[PDB]
């Protein structure tokens, strides 16, 4: 019905004559006293078609008057000028000749049909030697090579049935005598009982090539062609120029050189010349053909007088400039434009501002297209006087658009969805583009005279979908999680913070009023401290309203916000200080409860609310907004004095030069961090003079502090440099310096302090300007692998799933159950006894309040559906992802998870590899992640909880998701806090509080891993090396053990589960009181144990830690390279072995490079061997003996073998944790449902390990959507088939051979891809996205998913 | 590389086995291949190895070949070529290929020319011997004097006698009476006493002596040789077919055809003897012989076409190719002998010109016309021949060849006369070039020089220069606009004054399919005279009002 | 915004002009040139005085 | 297509305001038509099927 898709083969020397018309015989393009483009040459109108439109050469058939003819007088066609675009020519090659992409194409292709030295196959094609070809009166046999100086007498008794000959002719002749009715069927019986390995690593390339030839229609003669097809002139557009010069460029001149060489080779054979001259001209012809094909690649390039190479045919394809990337997957576009961004604070959220003459330009098709349709001009010709004039009649013609028309807008490079959105015109002055302030955040708009772009949609369908799918009001949220990014923006939120801050004296220390006009009555402030009873409401999930009422302690600005707040959520939410730290969560709560329109209005109307009051804050930066601690004087009498003796201790003989560097840099860090404590008292409270009648020691109104507590743009690392000490820096090598900046920006910077910190600034800004490429190129290659995951289906029957957990690094709660579970789905009937014995069935959509009922029972593991647990062909099933995060709903059938997930990783990686590194002129950290503190009178409610009392003095929590509610005197909750496992409580249940009052604490880098019970310490589900490795210190002798899990283990114990324990006077578990079960305390890796077996301890005492430098949405950080092989999935190229056999270890069978270790089990009778690298460090020699894989050397565990030795859900549970927890340390909480995409698409392939009678082979890794042919007929007709599985092919391998292969050609390494597409004669099915981009179709997502359903009922009729 | 070993071995007349490492081919490693390829190293170079001779040198004189004609003397191309450096240039491979010829100059290539002539001038002696060839030779002229009144046609482009060009018109006409007399006897006295039996051989020999002066233009010569090649293959196709039929029809392989045909070729006599042999194959002929007489009767029908017998074809048409084996070894070997002189001339011009390479290989084809017309019979040397002809074949190889554009050659290299002259301009006026100076340096007006420079640089869109206005395009593909300018002028020139509206259409083609002078127009104007013509111009002075063309001017634009 | 600067005018052609394709011009009106808007002009957005 | 290389598509879509039915009417992405003959000019055969 529609034309389906596309198929491939190669240009057979015969079949070219079904597409072409003769020798393109001569180099020229004109003839002196006649333009008539050369009769028989590069512009041969007899081969390519007419010149001017319809025009043949020599006369009689020109203008639209004549067409469909051939002129007699010079024998030339009469069609149209554009027929020169596809009426192909040819050139008969006077030798069998190569084609570069079958020879220079490593792995290459010609060798895979001959199994003979690829080094020198090229010389046989350069016609340098002979080979035996055919016979039955044989004496020599086939593929025997020769020179030429012997042949003679035997032809009188044998010379009826044998032959041998030279070069390319002999290779192309041998390729006639194979038999595919007998070769391919016999190439497969090794697979019964006997097949080998390196011969398989080579020859399976041939076996796949030959089977692929049989199954696709290919022929081996097409390696060694005898005809060059000729690029149609209109693709290299031959024309003259007004300057008496011609379009002779590159893709014309390369054919002149080939034509000349071939016309010599012809004449030399036509005359039977000296064969020297023929041999040289064959070599020169192949040189010119292969340079015309892919110039440079043949170890040389063809050039012209301005030194440059000429553009090849392959430079339309192979690298960056090729059609795929420059003219198809992106292209130049009409009805468009660009200009400099400008802030538009009176645009409503659905709108954008556009200059009148830009609206005129972008809307010309509506004007030169409606004057002739109303009579509002006499003609389109006369209308030049009226349209360019911007005359009145243009503007009815444009309201008829504007009044309901969605303009599209663009902030390239579009690494993430929100870089493109849709709006509505507003006419303006000027030459700029005016941009609504809430989307300026979603775009990352950077107002240094950078730009945005504009696109007009003109079909009724594009305008329908732009309002429905791309509109700002209709895509508000972060696709990675679901906070708004179309959001109250840069200074808007200082206005909202200012309206929601309060003061002492305050022009109203307690005071109230309505009426903005009372800012003109004499005594008011937005910081004046209102109090009011406000009755307040809260919408239930059923739609009713939970009415409430409360006394408040508030301000005029907090009260004005009850005009703006959607009053179906309660006033008490505004009773705070609405910096960027807080304001998003009001809109988020509205999105969770009320509805879309209410949440849009609440986001939009906050914008102008910010602009009415942001200025009136008077917040600044200035010379006394820069206060300094006086008591810095006393601190300089400590730190510089500590250094002063320590630099003597070196010279008097009590330190070397080296420890002395640390032992002074650490003191410069301690000087900065000492001054940083005094700095905060002076910046935030130091009004000392001694009350009564004095000493307003209030919480400060310093602007630089307010720029950080509003979250407007400030940080502790800015404040240190602006109020106490700039501190320390890196050198260009990255490491710290003994040369501090003890001053700050008000004290000043001397020449040296500037100059040294400028080196760190240069390094950081140069990495900012370069290391983006190490993320953007990777993002481009990622989408080719990621695309096909359109939400197509519903449950996929996959009754299995990943045991996900909160991020509990053994000894922290870095992510609670909520954030990771966020609108995923269960895969088991999960139940945990503890406080409410909750049960959450399989197939339940885990929106947040399912997690609340699980977190009360301190749920720490949940089996869930996964984007990897998804059987669905190309697309995916709704249960595997559950809820979208940007539009915010149960994920729409049509939503493209694939590209969304790639963008959700490529943007934040490339973004923060800039947004942290442009700071390298100074360094510091500061934290508070160690305590919980109450703020008013109330009572304590422990919750989500177990907890115990300790002989060593403590009260301690013993549950993973614990909470500490604060209650009033009557029963109202007033606050709650999450509290780690092992957190020390300073309060009991039902106890009492007043405020200013610490209530829980833990280690600055750890929730201490702590006991319920008292007994001997023990280990379980643990083995030394194979799950844990050792550290040691002195002081008394001391110990610690690093835990190891998924980057670190030997084969013999891969999937162990390390777990500390408490036991009786000899043996086994001191069963956990009130939950009477084993006293065993499971961990991941990267935690560190700090007590051992045979030690004896109490309830509420500690066994393990983490060195957790917490990261966060702050301090900041940045990096990438250690992620790479988690998505390229190899082994380390150095196998620095960790041994697989316990204790008995030696060397004894050494060999001609690598070492050979010799090993035996401790109670066995059976020796084994290991090949340690040639020279590699060993940390052992004779006594240093361990279990199966401690630090004998240091080789980390290969990621591909985490699949091979633990299976798909296990490897997914660590790739979707290590890369995820880099982004969690960046504060970028991406939900796991995104990195599961890259793991699904390494798992794109499916191993097969024998032949059959369906989709089945050995040594193969088929696209999983095909190999399901197994279940599709085994269960219906029985058939015959083999073992099949799933793989971890890296992006550089998984992409090269997709079924959507039209997309894969754009991946780069485009010779490697297109040779496989040629070998497989490949035939697409249009099932990703990029394939329909390339063929200009509706893409198989959303509104074109809604069309692919029709094709799925052509491909299935009956 | 190889040349070192084979050359020093041939200079020595002897090569010891181990000297394969003293004069090593800087190429390859094939140590176990030696024990048979040593064979054709020894039949034309024999030596072996032992402690010491005392009086034993002579061995070569009873055990070796004698001409180095074409064998391991030239097929050694493969064994010197075989290691072209896998990525490195045509400007390397030619150095291995010239591993053949060193410097055969100053008398060796003159001996190649001596051996061209004992080729060509001895093929002449068998043109004089194959009785159809000496017939078609005179048929060349008897085709054209036969029509009672002629002067040119095949009388011109023929006769062409390199009698060291020492003739006149009547001695040129005598070429059709002298040789015709030697022919018309021999033509039938080949049947008197027998084909070459006594004086028939002397008659052939004296016809073959006079024909030594019939040394001719290379294609009038090669027409007669091609005629003898084709008339040989009239028999060789029949042998090639009938030998195949001995296998295919008869089951009687190769040697058994030769055993019976080659002593009574002419007829089914030897085929009926092939039946008479008996044996199961011959026994099968008793019910298929008809299908072989249906082919062998057209070997017989070649003697029946000519008065030949295969007895002549056995030797004469081989004596031809014994002359060709010299003539076309030498017209190959002469090109080979000069392949270095082609580089030293061509490489001058390869100086970025278009490429460092290709002009050498076009010189190697210019060398063909040079080797064909090598008049050493003037006295001069092939060095000077190359300095003229082969140099200008090298010039033209990128003058108009391989360009965008090409012109008659005077109008190509004249553009380069101007660039050659510019070497004064850029230092004598001497700051920038000026065409105004070039006018005195050429003694000519700039525009009649711009005759070339307006179009011969890369050609503006001049459709068929300006003549495209009157060519094949005058069909409705243009003239529909003429039938619009004519309409608009017919409108205005019919609203103008009741008298004046005729005149102001006459002489040049304005309004009628024959835009007449007086007779048919005055008879439609009446009263008076050549106002009939003057009013074609009167319009200049009271049709002065420029609005008078308001409906006329569109026909430059439609 | 659009003024001429240098008069590089160019005539156009359309030419087909048969007895049932002469739709308007070549009989009934605008019987003067069809010059393409090809003269050099001030770009749409530029404004300011000619100085040399 | 209708805002780029497809001459057919862009020349109809521009005028589809005069149809009143402002709709797409594409014909062929010419940058893919180009590629289908550039691939054949290297020597790779490429063609189509129906559904």
Curated annotation (Swiss-Prot), chain B:
Places the protein is found: Cytoplasm
GO-annotated cellular components: cytosol; cytosolic DNA-directed RNA polymerase complex; sigma factor antagonist complex
GO molecular function, a single term: sigma factor activity
Region (Sigma-70 factor domain-3): 413-479
Keywords: Cytoplasm, DNA-binding, Sigma factor, Transcription, Transcription regulation
UniProt subunit comment: Interacts transiently with the RNA polymerase catalytic core formed by RpoA, RpoB, RpoC and RpoZ (2 alpha, 1 beta, 1 beta' and 1 omega subunit) to form the RNA polymerase holoenzyme that can initiate transcription. Identified in a complex containing RpoD, the RNA polymerase subunits RpoA, RpoB and RpoZ, CRP and DNA. Interacts with Rsd; this prevents interaction with the RNA polymerase catalytic core and with promoter DNA, and as a consequence, promotes transcription from promoters that require alternative sigma factors.
Protein name as annotated: RNA polymerase sigma factor RpoD
Origin organism lineage: Bacteria, Pseudomonadati, Pseudomonadota, Gammaproteobacteria, Enterobacterales
């Amino acid at each position: 019905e529609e034309f389906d898709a596309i198929k491939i083969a190669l240009a057979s020397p015969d079949m070219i004559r079904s597409w072409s018309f003769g020798e393109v015989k001569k180099p020229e393009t004109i003839n002196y006293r006649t333009f008539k483009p050369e009769r028989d040459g590069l512009f041969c109108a007899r081969i390519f078609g007419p010149v001017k439109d319809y025009e043949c050469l020599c006369g009689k058939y020109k203008r639209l008057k004549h067409r469909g003819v051939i002129c007699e007088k010079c024998g030339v066609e009469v069609t149209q000028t554009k027929v020169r675009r596809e009426r192909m020519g040819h050139i008969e090659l006077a030798s069998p000749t190569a084609h570069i992409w079958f020879l220079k194409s490593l792995p290459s292709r010609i060798g895979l049909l001959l199994d003979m030295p690829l080094r020198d196959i090229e010389r046989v094609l350069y016609f340098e030697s002979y080979v035996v070809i055919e016979g039955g009166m044989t004496n020599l046999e086939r593929q025997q090579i020769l020179t030429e100086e012997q042949y003679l007498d035997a032809l009188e008794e044998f010379g009826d049935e044998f032959d041998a000959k030279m070069g390319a002719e002999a290779i192309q002749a041998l390729l006639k005598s194979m038999d595919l009715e007998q070769e391919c069927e016999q190439l497969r019986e090794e697979l019964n009982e006997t097949n080998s390995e390196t011969k398989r690593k080579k020859l399976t390339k041939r076996i796949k090539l030959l089977e692929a030839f049989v199954q696709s229609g290919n022929k081996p003669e097409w390696m060694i062609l005898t005809v060059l097809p000729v690029l149609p002139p209109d693709l290299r557009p031959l024309v003259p120029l007004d300057g008496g010069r011609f379009a002779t460029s590159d893709l014309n001149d390369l054919y002149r050189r080939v034509i000349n060489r071939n016309n010599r080779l012809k004449r030399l054979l036509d005359l039977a010349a000296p064969d020297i001259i023929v041999r040289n001209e064959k070599r020169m012809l192949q040189e010119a053909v292969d340079a015309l094909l892919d110039n440079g690649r043949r170890g040389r390039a063809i050039t012209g007088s301005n030194k440059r190479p000429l553009k090849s045919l392959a430079d339309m394809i192979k690298g960056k400039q090729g059609r795929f990337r420059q003219n198809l997957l992106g292209k130049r576009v009409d009805y468009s434009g660009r200009s400099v961004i400008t802030v538009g604070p009176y645009l409503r959220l659905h709108q954008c501002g556009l200059p009148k003459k830009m609206a005129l330009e972008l809307f010309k098709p509506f004007i030169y297209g409606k004057l002739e349709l109303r009579g509002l001009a006499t003609t389109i010709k006369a209308a030049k006087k009226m349209v360019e004039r911007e005359e009145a009649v243009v503007w009815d013609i444009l309201d008829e658009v504007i009044r309901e028309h969605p303009v599209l807008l663009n902030r390239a490079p579009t690494l993430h969805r929100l870089g493109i959105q849709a709006f509505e015109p507003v006419l303006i002055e000027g030459k700029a583009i005016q941009l609504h302030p809430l989307v300026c955040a979603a775009y990352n708009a950077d107002f240094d005279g950078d730009q945005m772009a504009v696109h007009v949609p003109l079909t009724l369908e594009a305008q329908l979908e732009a309002r429905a799918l791309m509109m700002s009001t209709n895509n508000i949220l972060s696709p990675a999680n679901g906070e708004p990014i179309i959001v109250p923006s840069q200074d808007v939120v200082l206005g909202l913070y200012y309206m929601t801050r309060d003061c002492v004296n305050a022009k109203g220390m307690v005071l109230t009023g309505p009426a903005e006009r009372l800012y003109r009555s004499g005594l008011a402030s937005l910081h004046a401290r209102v109090k009011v009873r406000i009755t307040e409401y809260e919408k239930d999930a059923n739609g009713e309203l939970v009415a409430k009422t409360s006394l408040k302690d508030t301000t005029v600005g907090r009260a004005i916000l009850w005009m703006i707040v959607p009053k179906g959520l309660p006033y008490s939410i505004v009773n705070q200080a609405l910096g960027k730290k807080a304001i998003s969560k009001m809109l988020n709560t509205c999105y969770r409860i009320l509805g879309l329109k209410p949440t849009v209005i609440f986001a939009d109307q906050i914008m102008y609310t910010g602009f009415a009051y942001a200025a009136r804050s008077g917040a600044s930066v200035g010379i006394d907004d820069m206060v300094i601690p006086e008591k810095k004087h006393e601190i300089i009498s400590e730190a510089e004095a500590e250094v002063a003796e320590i630099q003597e201790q070196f010279q008097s003989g009590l330190v070397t030069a080296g420890e002395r560097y640390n032992k002074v840099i650490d003191i410069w860090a301690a000087a900065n961090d000492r001054v940083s404590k005094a700095m905060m008292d002076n910046l935030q409270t130091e009004t000392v003079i001694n009350r009564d009648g004095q000493e307003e020691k209030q919480v400060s109104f310093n602007s630089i502090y307010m720029m950080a507590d509003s979250g407007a743009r400030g940080s502790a690392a800015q404040i240190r440099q602006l109020a106490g000490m700039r501190g320390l820096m890196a050198k260009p090598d990255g490491s710290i310096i003994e040369t501090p900046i003890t001053a700050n920006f008000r004290e000043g910077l001397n020449v040296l302090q500037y100059f040294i910190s400028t080196h760190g600034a240069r390094k950081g800004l140069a990495d900012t300007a370069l290391k983006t490429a190490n993320s953007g190129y990777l993002t481009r290659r990622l989408v080719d692998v990621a695309q096909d995951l359109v939400v197509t289906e519903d449950d996929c029957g996959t009754h299995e799933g990943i045991m996900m957990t909160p991020v509990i690094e053994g000894g922290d709660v870095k992510e609670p159950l909520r954030d990771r579970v966020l609108g995923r789905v269960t895969a088991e009937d999960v139940l945990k006894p503890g406080t409410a014995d909750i049960l959450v069935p399989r197939n339940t959509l885990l929106h947040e309040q399912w997690c609340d009922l699980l977190e009360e029972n301190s749920v720490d593991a949940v089996k869930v559906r996964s984007v990897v647990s998804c059987d669905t062909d190309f697309g995916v099933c709704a249960h595997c992802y559950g809820r979208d995060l940007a539009r915010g709903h149960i994920i729409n059938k049509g939503e493209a998870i694939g590209v969304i997930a790639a963008q959700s990783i490529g943007e934040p990686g490339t973004q923060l590899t800039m947004r942290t590194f442009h700071i390298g002129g100074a360094a510091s950290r500061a934290a508070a992640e160690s305590s919980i503190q109450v703020k008013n009178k109330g009572s304590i409610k422990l919750s989500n909880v177990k907890s115990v009392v300790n002989s060593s003095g403590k009260l301690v929590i013993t549950s993973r998701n614990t909470e500490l509610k604060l209650i009033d005197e009557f029963g109202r909750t007033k606050e709650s806090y999450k509290v780690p496992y092992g957190a020390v409580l300073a309060k009991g249940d039902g106890e009492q509080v007043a405020g200013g009052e610490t209530v829980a604490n833990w280690d600055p880098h750890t929730m201490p891993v702590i006991t319920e019970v008292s007994g001997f310490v023990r280990f379980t589900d643990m083995i030394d090396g194979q799950t844990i490795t050792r550290q040691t210190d002195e002081l008394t002798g001391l110990s610690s053990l690093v835990v190891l899990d998924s980057a670190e283990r030997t084969a013999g114990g891969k999937d162990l589960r390390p777990a500390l324990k408490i036991v009786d006077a000899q043996g086994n578990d001191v069963l956990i009181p009130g939950t009477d079960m084993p006293a065993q305390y499971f961990l991941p890796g990267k935690a560190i144990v700090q007590l051992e077996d045979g030690v004896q301890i109490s309830s509420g005492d500690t066994l393990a830690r983490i060195p957790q430098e917490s990261g966060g949405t702050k301090d900041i950080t940045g990096g990438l390279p250690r992620v790479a092989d988690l998505f390229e999935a190899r082994r380390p190229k150095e196998p620095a072995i960790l041994a697989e056999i316990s204790g008995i270890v030696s060397f004894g069978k050494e060999t001609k490079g690598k070492r050979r270790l010799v090993i035996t089990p401790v109670d066995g009778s059976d020796p084994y061997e290991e090949m340690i690298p040639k020279w590699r460090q060993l940390n052992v020699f004779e006594g240093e003996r361990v279990e199966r894989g401690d630090v004998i050397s240091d080789g980390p565990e290969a990621p591909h073998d985490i699949l091979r030795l633990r299976g798909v859900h296990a490897v997914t549970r660590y790739i979707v944790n290590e890369v995820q927890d880099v982004y969690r340390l960046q504060g970028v909480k991406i939900n796991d449902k995104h990195i599961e995409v890259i793991v699904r698409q390494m798992l794109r392939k499916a191993t097969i390990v024998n032949a059959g009678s369906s989709d089945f082979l050995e040594g193969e890794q088929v696209e999983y959507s095909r190999v399901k042919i197994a279940n599709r007929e085994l269960e219906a007709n029985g058939k015959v088939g083999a073992t099949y599985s799933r793989d971890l092919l890296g992006i550089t391998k998984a992409s090269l051979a997709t079924e959507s292969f039209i997309s894969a050609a754009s991946f780069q390494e485009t010779t490697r891809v297109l040779t496989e597409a040629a070998v497989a004669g490949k035939r697409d099915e249009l099932r990703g996205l990029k394939e329909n981009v390339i063929v200009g179709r509706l893409i198989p997502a959303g509104t074109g998913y809604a069309y692919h359903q029709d094709r799925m009922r052509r491909r299935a009729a009956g | 590389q190889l040349k070192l070993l084979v050359t020093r071995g041939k200079e020595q007349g002897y090569l010891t086995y181990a000297e394969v490492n003293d004069h090593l081919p800087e190429d390859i490693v094939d140590s176990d291949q030696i024990e048979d390829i040593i064979q054709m190293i020894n039949d034309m170079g024999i030596q072996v190895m032992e402690e010491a001779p005392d009086a034993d040198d002579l061995m070569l004189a009873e055990n070796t070949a004698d001409e180095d004609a074409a064998e391991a003397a030239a097929q050694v191309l493969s064994s010197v070529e075989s290691e072209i450096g896998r990525t490195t240039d045509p400007v390397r491979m030619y150095m291995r290929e010239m591993g053949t010829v060193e410097l055969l100059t100053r008398e060796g290539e003159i001996d190649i020319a001596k051996r061209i002539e004992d080729g060509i001038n001895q093929v002449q002696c068998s043109v004089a011997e194959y009785p159809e060839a000496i017939t078609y030779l005179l048929e060349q002229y008897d085709r054209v004097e036969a029509e009672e009144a002629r002067l040119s046609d095949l009388i011109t482009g023929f006769v062409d006698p390199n009698a060291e060009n020492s003739i006149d018109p009547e001695l040129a006409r005598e070429k059709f009476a002298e040789l015709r007399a030697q022919y018309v006897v021999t033509r039938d006295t080949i049947k008197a006493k027998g084909r070459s039996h006594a004086t028939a051989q002397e008659e052939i020999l004296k016809l073959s002596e006079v024909f030594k002066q019939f040394r001719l233009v290379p294609k009038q010569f090669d027409y007669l040789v091609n005629s003898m090649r084709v008339m040989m293959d009239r028999v060789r196709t029949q042998e090639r077919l009938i030998m195949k039929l001995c296998v295919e029809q008869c089951k009687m392989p190769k040697k058994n055809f030769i055993t019976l045909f080659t002593g009574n070729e002419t007829s089914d006599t030897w085929f009926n003897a092939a039946i008479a042999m008996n044996k199961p194959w011959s026994e099968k002929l008793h019910d298929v012989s008809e299908e072989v007489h249906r082919a062998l009767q057209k070997l017989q029908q070649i003697e029946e076409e000519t008065g030949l017998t295969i007895e002549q074809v056995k030797d004469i048409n081989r004596r031809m190719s014994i002359g060709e084996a010299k003539a076309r070894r030498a017209k190959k070997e002469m090109v080979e002998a000069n392949l270095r002189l082609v580089i030293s001339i061509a490489k001058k011009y390869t100086n970025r010109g278009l490429q460092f390479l290709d002009l050498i290989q076009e010189g190697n084809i210019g060398l063909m016309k040079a080797v064909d017309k090598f008049e050493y019979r003037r006295g001069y040397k092939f060095s000077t021949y190359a300095t003229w002809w082969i140099r200008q074949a090298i010039t033209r190889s990128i003058a108009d060849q391989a360009r965008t554009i090409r012109i008659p050659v005077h109008m190509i290299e004249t553009i380069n006369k101007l660039n050659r002259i510019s070497r004064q301009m850029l230092q004598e006026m001497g700051r920038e070039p000026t065409p105004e100076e070039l006018a005195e340096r050429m003694l000519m007006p700039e525009d009649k020089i711009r005759k070339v420079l307006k179009i011969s640089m890369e050609t503006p869109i001049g459709d068929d220069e300006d003549s495209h206005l009157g060519i094949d395009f005058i069909e409705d593909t243009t003239s529909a606009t003429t039938e619009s300018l004519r309409a608009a002028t017919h409108d205005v020139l019919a609203g103008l004054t009741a008298r004046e509206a005729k005149v102001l259409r006459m002489r040049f083609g304005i309004d009628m399919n024959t835009d007449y002078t007086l007779e048919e127009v005055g008879k439609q104007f009446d009263v008076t005279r050549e106002r009939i013509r003057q009013i074609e111009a009167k319009a200049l002075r009271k049709l002065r009002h420029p609005s008078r063309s308001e409906v006329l001017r569109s026909f430059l634009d439609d | 915004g659009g003024d001429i600067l240098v008069g590089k005018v160019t005539p156009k052609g359309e030419t087909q002009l048969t007895p049932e394709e002469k739709l308007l011009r070549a009989i009934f009106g605008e019987k003067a040139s069809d010059v393409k808007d090809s003269s050099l002009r001030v770009p749409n957005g530029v404004s300011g005085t000619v100085i040399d | 297509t209708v805002k780029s290389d497809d001459v057919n598509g862009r020349t109809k879509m521009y005028k589809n305001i005069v149809d009143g039915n402002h709709q797409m009417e594409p014909g062929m992405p010419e940058s893919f038509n180009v590629l289908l003959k550039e691939i054949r000019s290297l020597g790779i055969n490429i063609e189509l099927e129906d559904e």
